[PDB]
Amino acid sequence: HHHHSTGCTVGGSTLNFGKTSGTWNNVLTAEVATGGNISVTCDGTDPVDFTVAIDGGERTDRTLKNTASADVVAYNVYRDAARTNLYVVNQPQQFTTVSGQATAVPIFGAINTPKAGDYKDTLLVTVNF
Amino acid sequence: ATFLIWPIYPKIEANEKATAVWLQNTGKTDAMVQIRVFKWNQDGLKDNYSEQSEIIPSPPVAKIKAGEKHMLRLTKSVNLPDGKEQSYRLIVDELPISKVSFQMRYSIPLFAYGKGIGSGLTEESQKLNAKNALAKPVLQWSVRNNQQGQSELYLKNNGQKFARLSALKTSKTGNDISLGKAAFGYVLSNSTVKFAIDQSTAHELAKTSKIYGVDSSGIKQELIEITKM
């Protein structure tokens, strides 16, 4: 037949926080769990284990940048909405697929000397089988 | 952007000069991707990747329009050492073309074989491995504490082939012990790895002598005996 060569459809199939200028004085929430979110779908009868790791941004410390300035503001992303499970930088978290259902890769985000218009960063999301 | 990768578990047999991985953009938007293969080892009980020339991926860069299916040719430059299994990752990097945005990277394992050993996923290699006593994973375990006090499980593979572990059981009929945090799974051939385990599992473990891992490295999922060091 022979054996089943498994094949998967990996995501996606951004995190807009709003404004980080001036003062907020509480933690900012943004979610991708937006253009759709990320999910792995495999096709065996067996489940497939896989692994997702998130880097530390363009500066390795998960810090945005204003673009106009050296103004930087730090952040972190989490697997659960409750933010108990940190996507610790470059450390993989285990996932599994159930036969015939998509597994979401959720990413929940969070974040005073006020800084004042538009800040940016880019995260590397590695999915490993 | 959205990709169908097949096969997720590619191998190059001893007597093949290449294999193919298929990459299909199933999104509605054009995508651009970089293709690389890294040699893969577990020296120092951590996973390490190095650039490498034993396997050459073709094309190294590709525009994949929506709906199109491209054939990655993974080529074995020279014959590999006798009776050994070599470990790689194919890395597929999606190139881009107050916010924070995501760049995706997809990594599948690749395994190539030298004379006298094979994946075991075809009848030709199955018959080849029956003649090799160590053409399989041959695992040992022992749990040891750090000076900081963290508990960590050591898995050591004596066999010429890797093991992909989904779970650890304490008996052939038991249930999976709750490996809490920290991913684990691959113990490559002729290596040993080291997972961080919570306290709930040390004790549960090491109240038993043999344990059993669920292994997908071959055709079907199967228990394997892990003995104590």
Side-chain angles (χ1 to χ4, degrees), chain A residues 8 10-12 123 125 127 129, chain B residues 1 3 5 101 103 105-107 186:
Chain A
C8 307
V10 295
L123 278 175
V125 176
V127 176
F129 300 94
Chain B
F3 290 116
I5 311 161
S101 39
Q103 186 174 334
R105 170 183 280 195
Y106 308 106
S107 148
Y186 284 99

Side-chain angles (χ1 to χ4, degrees), chain B residues 78 84 118 121 128 174 201 206 213:
Chain B
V78 302
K84 244 64 165 308
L121 311 175
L128 187 42
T201 45

Side-chain angles (χ1 to χ4, degrees), chain B residues 79-114:
Chain B
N79 273 4
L80 293 153
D82 284 355
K84 244 64 165 308
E85 172 197 71
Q86 304 306 326
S87 315
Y88 313 92
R89 317 279 307 171
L90 183 72
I91 308 313
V92 166
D93 263 317
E94 175 209 72
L95 302 188
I97 228 83
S98 182
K99 309 131 46 181
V100 55
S101 39
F102 295 115
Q103 186 174 334
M104 301 307 307
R105 170 183 280 195
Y106 308 106
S107 148
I108 72 172
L110 169 71
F111 291 106
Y113 299 81

Side-chain angles (χ1 to χ4, degrees), chain A:
Chain A
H1 339 291
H2 182 289
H3 139 77
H4 187 72
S5 290
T6 318
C8 307
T9 298
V10 295
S13 158
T14 75
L15 275 186
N16 198 9
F17 276 112
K19 62 162 301 155
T20 166
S21 52
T23 197
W24 53 93
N25 213 264
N26 56 89
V27 178
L28 288 62
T29 253
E31 114 183 327
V32 167
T34 175
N37 307 329
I38 302 168
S39 70
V40 180
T41 295
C42 298
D43 80 335
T45 57
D46 295 354
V48 172
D49 273 8
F50 73 87
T51 250
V52 171
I54 299 193
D55 77 332
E58 294 171 16
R59 296 153 265 277
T60 78
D61 54 356
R62 283 170 186 184
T63 55
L64 298 96
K65 175 192 158 56
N66 180 244
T67 55
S69 46
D71 256 0
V72 304
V73 19
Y75 66 100
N76 260 314
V77 285
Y78 305 83
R79 183 171 179 177
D80 59 327
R83 297 197 295 282
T84 79
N85 194 6
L86 178 72
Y87 280 116
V88 29
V89 184
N90 294 323
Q91 294 298 133
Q93 232 147 109
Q94 192 74 42
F95 287 67
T96 308
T97 66
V98 189
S99 187
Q101 313 152 16
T103 300
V105 185
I107 301 178
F108 302 88
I111 312 290
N112 294 338
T113 324
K115 337 127 183 301
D118 289 344
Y119 294 70
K120 297 217 195 78
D121 196 1
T122 290
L123 278 175
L124 180 61
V125 176
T126 316
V127 176
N128 311 90
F129 300 94

Side-chain angles (χ1 to χ4, degrees), chain B residues 111-132:
Chain B
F111 291 106
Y113 299 81
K115 201 185 76 199
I117 190 182
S119 78
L121 311 175
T122 66
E123 197 189 346
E124 187 191 70
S125 53
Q126 280 183 174
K127 291 198 290 268
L128 187 42
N129 287 338
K131 311 196 152 190
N132 187 337

Side-chain angles (χ1 to χ4, degrees), chain B residues 196-208:
Chain B
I197 65 173
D198 63 359
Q199 197 49 231
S200 210
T201 45
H203 166 282
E204 204 178 344
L205 232 48
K207 98 191 329 153
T208 192

